[PDB]
Amino acid sequence: SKNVVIYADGVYDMLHLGHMKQLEQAKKLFENTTLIVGVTSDNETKLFKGQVVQTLEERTETLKHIRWVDEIISPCPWVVTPEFLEKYKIDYVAHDDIYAWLKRAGKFKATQRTEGVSTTDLIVRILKNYE
Amino acid sequence: SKNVVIYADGVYDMLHLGHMKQLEQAKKLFENTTLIVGVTSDNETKLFKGQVVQTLEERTETLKHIRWVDEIISPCPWVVTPEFLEKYKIDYVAHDDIYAWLKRAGKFKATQRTEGVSTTDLIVRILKNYE
């Protein structure tokens, strides 16, 4: 069966069960996939999104331990371009209009988030040992 | 090359880069390994060790996403017994005297911890945005 190249990008700050469920979903979009994961740079995340607690090196070294991940681009470009897809032979971009041109080319696959499971939520759970 | 069965157990509460480096180390003790990971039960961890923030289901569902892990025993027995090793065809127990009988049988492989990388340490890093 023919192999399909899948690209997911994101911050992957303090990786939790919600990220790994996302990655798994992207990896199993097809029978034979190569999941490529892009890890956004510290300064671009700072500028365009918000605070990130872990460095690019930390966030990438963690992703290396997740099973669904076949290749990592670190740092990845903030915006996905058509030439980026050709350069890495990417068949689909997995994400959860800005991505409008990806849908138009048939190259967009949606995947779900999972709430509650996040790292910040776990501290709230430690803290509710007190009143 | 002959396959070797490796067993690591622990709490794996709020899995961080230090755990995954431990698992990877255990998995690469030999060329062909099966890494079996044992996840201690909520009540035994409570009793014998301390507070654990994540449930057995949560801690096990996270380990399922780590690459080095081939099999999970959940919950695992708190103490490793000789009959436990025979039942699962375990050749070595990976851990960081109590384990004295494992060394005597040639069944103990040491692996290292990695400090600083822990989940609790990451919140301390968020908090040092203030004085």
Residues in chain B: 131
Chains A and B: how many Cβ contacts under 8 Å? 50
Instruction: Work out whether the CA dihedral B53, B55, B61, B67 comes out positive or negative.
Output: positive
- Resolution for this experimental structure (Å): 2.2
- Is A123 in contact with B125 (Cβ distance < 8 A)? no
Minimal-distance CA residue of chain A relative to B64: A67
DSSP letters for chain A: ---EEEEEEE--TT--HHHHHHHHHHHTTSSSEEEEEEEE-HHHHHHHT---SS-HHHHHHHHTTBTT--EEEEEEPSS--HHHHHHTT--EEEE---THHHHHTT-EEE-----S-SHHHHHHHHHTT--
Nearest chain B CA: its distance from A49 CA (Å): 16
CA angle B125, A71, A13 (to 5 degrees): 20
Which of A42, A62, A65, A71 should one mutate to test binding to chain B, selecting the residue with the greatest count of B CBs within 10 A? A65
B128 CB within 8 Å of a chain A CB: no
Give yes or no for a contact between B90 and B5, defined as CB atoms under 8 angstroms apart: yes
Which of B65, B69, B70 should one mutate to test binding to chain A, selecting the residue with the greatest count of A CBs within 10 A? B65
In angstroms, the CA A77 to CA B40 distance is 41
In angstroms, the CA A58 to CA A75 distance is 12
Task: From chain B, pick out residues whose CB is under 8 angstroms from the CB of A23.
Answer: 65
Give yes or no for a contact between A3 and A44, defined as CB atoms under 8 angstroms apart: no
* Strand, helix or coil for residue B28: coil
Minimal-distance CA residue of chain B relative to A58: B17
Instruction: Work out whether the CA dihedral A99, A100, A101, A105 comes out positive or negative.
Output: positive
Which of B12, B16, B17, B62 should one mutate to test binding to chain A, selecting the residue with the greatest count of A CBs within 10 A? B17
